[PDB]
């Protein structure tokens, strides 16, 4: 358990699913939970509400590691991405900072031609 | 002869040898009868982003007017010198003077 003091809640959110992972400041993850793992699958899985429940399931078992204050790193858009944020704060942790990092290219790889 | 605005960064450890680098290229400058204008070494300056490593670098400005042939030879050295990092050159624009800082 080691009883760490500060961890980083990496929340990789997509237009279809949202993974919640409270890692360590070192990056070595100590636990995670997903919107799909919290029950809701399919349409209900891709909702801001589902994002909120996933936050709590991940917020649990981290107090075991004793993370008091933590950093939040959100990645990519999606139905949640902002609903689970307050749900993570309501969990009872000190939100030190929220750094939004996204894979925004400078016109690199080729995008698909889907969605017709 | 054309004017140039040579500028490059140096590894902090090799920052101690910057005079020698300048003096060597100054020999190249005199070896080309190039009308050197500036020599404003801005010193050990921190970068906007870590270039593979090194948060801090060592900027140096030359801004020298020189013959076409020598400028070709000079840049090849930078690509084969492990001390120098990011060594670009510019065009004439009527030889300049004083620094910005």
């Amino acid at each position: 358990r080691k009883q760490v003091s500060d961890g980083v809640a990496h929340i990789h959110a997509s237009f279809n699913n949202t993974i919640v992972t409270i890692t360590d400041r070192q990056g070595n993850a100590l636990g995670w939970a997903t919107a799909g793992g919290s029950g809701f699958r399919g349409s209900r899985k891709s909702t801001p509400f589902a994002a909120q429940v996933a936050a709590e399931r991940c917020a649990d078992a981290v107090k075991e590691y004793g993370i008091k204050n933590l950093e939040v790193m959100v990645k990519g858009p999606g139905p949640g991405r902002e609903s689970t944020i307050r749900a993570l704060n309501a969990a009872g942790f000190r939100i030190t900072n929220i750094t939004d990092v996204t894979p925004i290219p400078h016109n690199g790889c080729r995008p698909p031609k889907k969605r017709r | 002869m054309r004017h140039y605005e040579i500028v490059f960064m140096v590894h902090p450890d090799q920052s101690e040898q910057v005079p020698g680098m300048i003096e060597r290229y100054t020999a190249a400058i005199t070896g080309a009868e190039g009308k050197i204008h500036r020599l404003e070494d801005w010193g050990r300056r921190q970068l906007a982003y870590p270039i593979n490593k090194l948060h801090k670098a060592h900027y140096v400005l030359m801004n020298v007017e020189a013959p076409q042939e020598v400028i070709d030879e000079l840049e090849t050295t930078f690509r084969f010198n492990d001390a120098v990092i990011r060594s670009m050159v510019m065009r004439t624009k009527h030889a300049v003077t004083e620094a910005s800082p």
């Binding site: 750094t99 | 906007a48 990011r86 670009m88 910005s100």
Partner: protein, 65 residues
Amino acid sequence: FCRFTAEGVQEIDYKDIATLKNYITESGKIVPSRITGTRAKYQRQLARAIKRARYLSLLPYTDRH
């Protein structure tokens, strides 16, 4: 319609990053002429100064490294 070298004729440099900061956002993105109001001729000169500064690691391409 903002003031520039339109009357006080001068030349644009890249070393004056302080002034270059006046034409970029927090993420270091080139601010369009629709906001600056500056002329297109100097806007291109401004953009070249930014890319030169970005290459010399003066002004970051993006925030996080």
